[PDB]
């Protein structure tokens, strides 16, 4: 009982501190900045060959190679520049929920309800792609495992617990705990010394990879958090809640800077990413289209329609050249 | 140029990949996928004697292959990994009949599954296991349905009942009452997009495979008829 009163007092004090910190508003500060304009990105490619719904994809470091995964149980390495199946990998378990591309471009990972995301070698001397390491130890289903280095990999499973592994030994080296609900997505920092995660408890947390402990928490969403991406300078980030609204957060100020929501949109979000310049914010809704938001003004910059079914994943190349979006119709469409 | 050799190798690799992928797609279309469900310790892992997310089964009937999955490793929370089965042939639902206390939870879970947005267009083959146990409990009379369901006091056996030889009127009435209670949720509002196929099975039943075969044939035929607009 006393602990409850202490927690309530601490929460009230934190809220008062944030309220005192707030002085102005982003729209008022940036009101004097002109609109970007109605952008009309037109499809430049269409990638075909995946039988079932597509859940996740990842760009390579060179902005020319990327990987996709679908429920049918196949891993395909495409080539956006020239549409070709560079490699095809059939998974042991037909169920998969995420895919990753090592920054070195020599390894990929993918996992799902099997509670494991394994390691595939793409620089085989024998020439045949084979699984090198499978990491076991997670309790719930694996929601997302993103690469950190050729030997370090991060993960977030269905048991409300992220994990930093070491493939050469395949042993959990640090455990991130403290999340009430399920963990959906994470986004590493460009400095690769931190990473923020979203969970199905209307909250997001910031960790320290070396020290392994939550550093801060943010709560401004009514429903679960599906996607989380990092601002390229590592001083802000935005999330897409299922409540049909996207918000922008700051680490230094530690408040919800701005929100993106209109009356005409009432569907849930599934993916989020930031354009290289940082002025454009992309959101993939549940009504079979993606929306482009003027990040610093929170006004509809434009629409990106032309998907038969739900748009699950989304991403922007490293150089901010091409945008790739996968959907439930089993098609990947690249936008200039 | 001397760089188009890489293009030739790329074309050869792409051709091989497509050639294999065609066979893979053919097989994947050929196979039929089913999702198993039901409360724990309810004959879920033993509905089929196996005479043919984590757990999968492979049984073939009349040169037709069926793929049934048993999600039995994940946590209790369900509203997120359930969506990964929105394109299955049908969902198998198994619910025990002699546990009046968990029966209400079974009704609520089934209703939520029926109303789920992303599963709005999937039919379910409903099962009702432990009929012998229900008969034993009814004959014993220690408990009573009325102590849980007040509406049962004003229920009567349907005129279309097909009782098994010697089936007591009391046990038959209870069975069909539970069946109607299940069916009411589905028939409430579905718009004809999907339906249910209630059954009366037991732990000793060995013909469940035939029943699911007939049910899946019927539903696929109904889908083929819905296309072409009847």
């Amino acid at each position: 009982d006393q602990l409850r009163q202490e927690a309530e007092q601490l929460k009230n004090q934190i809220r008062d501190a944030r309220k005192a910190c707030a002085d102005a508003t982003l729209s008022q500060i940036t009101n004097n900045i002109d609109p970007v304009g109605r952008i009309q990105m037109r499809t430049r490619r269409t990638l075909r060959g995946h039988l079932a719904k597509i859940y996740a994809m990842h760009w390579g470091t060179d902005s020319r190679l990327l990987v996709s995964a679908s429920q049918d149980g196949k891993l395909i390495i495409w080539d956006s520049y020239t549409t070709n199946k560079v490699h095809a990998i059939p998974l042991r378990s037909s169920w998969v929920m995420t895919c990753a591309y090592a920054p070195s471009g020599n390894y990929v990972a993918c996992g799902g309800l099997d509670n494991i995301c394994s390691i595939y070698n793409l620089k085989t001397r024998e020439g045949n792609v084979r699984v090198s390491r499978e990491l076991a130890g997670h309790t719930g289903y694996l929601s997302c495992c993103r690469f950190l280095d050729d030997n370090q990999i991060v993960t977030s499973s269905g048991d409300t617990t992220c994990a930093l592994w070491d493939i050469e030994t395949g042993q959990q080296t640090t455990t991130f705990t403290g999340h009430t609900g399920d963990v959906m997505s994470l986004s590493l920092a460009p400095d690769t010394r931190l990473f923020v995660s979203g969970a199905c408890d209307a909250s997001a947390k910031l960790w320290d990879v070396r020290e392994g402990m939550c550093r801060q928490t943010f709560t401004g969403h009514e429903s679960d958090i599906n996607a989380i991406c990092f601002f390229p300078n590592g001083n802000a980030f935005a999330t897409g809640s299922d409540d049909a609204t996207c918000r922008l957060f700051d680490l230094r100020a530690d408040q919800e800077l701005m929100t993106y929501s209109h009356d005409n949109i009432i569907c849930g979000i599934t993916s989020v990413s930031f354009s290289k310049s940082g002025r454009l914010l992309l959101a993939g809704y549940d009504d079979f289209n993606c929306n482009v938001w003027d990040a610093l003004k929170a006004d509809r910059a434009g629409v990106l329609a032309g998907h038969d079914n739900r748009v699950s994943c989304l991403g922007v190349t490293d150089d901010g050249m091409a945008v790739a979006t996968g959907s439930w119709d089993s098609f990947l469409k690249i936008w200039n | 140029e001397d760089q188009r050799n890489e293009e030739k190798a790329q074309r050869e690799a792409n051709k091989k990949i497509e050639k294999q992928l065609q066979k893979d797609k053919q097989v994947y279309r050929a196979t039929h996928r089913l999702l198993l469900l039901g409360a724990d310790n309810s004959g879920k892992s033993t509905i089929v004697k196996q005479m043919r997310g984590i757990f999968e089964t492979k049984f073939q009937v009349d040169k037709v292959n069926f793929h049934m999955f048993d999600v039995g490793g994940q946590r209790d929370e369900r509203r997120k990994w359930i969506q990964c089965f929105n394109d299955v042939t049908a969902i198998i639902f198994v619910v025990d009949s002699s546990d009046y206390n968990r029966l209400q939870e079974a009704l609520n879970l089934f209703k939520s599954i029926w109303n789920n947005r992303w599963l709005r267009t999937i039919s379910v083959i409903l099962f009702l296991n432990k009929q012998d146990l229900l008969a034993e409990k009814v004959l014993a009379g220690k408990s009573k349905i009325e102590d849980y369901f007040p509406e049962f006091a004003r229920y009567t056996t349907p005129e279309d009942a097909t009782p098994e030889p010697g089936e007591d009127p009391r046990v038959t009435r209870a069975k069909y009452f539970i069946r109607d209670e299940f069916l009411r949720i589905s028939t409430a509002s579905g718009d004809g997009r999907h339906y249910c196929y209630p059954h009366f099975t037991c732990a000793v039943d060995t013909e469940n495979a035939r029943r699911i075969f007939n049910d899946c044939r019927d539903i696929i035929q109904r889908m083929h008829l819905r296309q072409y607009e009847l």
Epitope: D201, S223, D224, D243 | R75, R79, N108, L109, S112, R117
Partner: nanobody
């Protein structure tokens, strides 16, 4: 930010009246479907009642049919559940659970001591 405080409740003789309230804040109250869920001592959770967006659709469990009333008020961000004629086995922790999806009526919110948007509780016991 999501908070659900459940006031009311107390010791009452068998067959007496009562009233329970679930104060909520941090979200648009009118865009969610509310439920009451109880956990009898030495047992798991279980559904009790529910209510639709504007209060049109209502439902109840078997044992409370006709003995409990659920009332909602969106203009104040509060939700009541009037209780009348309670029996000895009515004693249990009561919660005010909201499932996440707005503008839908389908959800799984009786998780085994793991749900996130569930009120902390409001103890009510019946004694002689």
């Amino acid at each position: 930010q999501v908070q659900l405080q459940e006031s009311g409740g107390g010791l009452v003789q068998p067959g007496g009246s009562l009233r329970l309230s679930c104060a909520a804040s941090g979200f648009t109250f009118s865009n969610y479907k509310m439920n009451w869920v109880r956990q009898a001592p030495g047992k798991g959770l279980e559904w009790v009642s529910d209510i639709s967006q504007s209060g049109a659709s209502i439902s109840y469990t078997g044992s409370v049919k006709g003995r409990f009333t659920i009332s909602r008020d969106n203009a104040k961000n509060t939700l009541y559940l009037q209780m009348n004629s309670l029996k000895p086995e009515d004693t249990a922790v009561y919660y005010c659970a909201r499932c996440p999806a707005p503008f839908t009526r389908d959800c799984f919110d009786v998780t085994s001591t793991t749900y996130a948007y569930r009120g902390q509780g409001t103890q009510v016991t019946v004694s002689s």
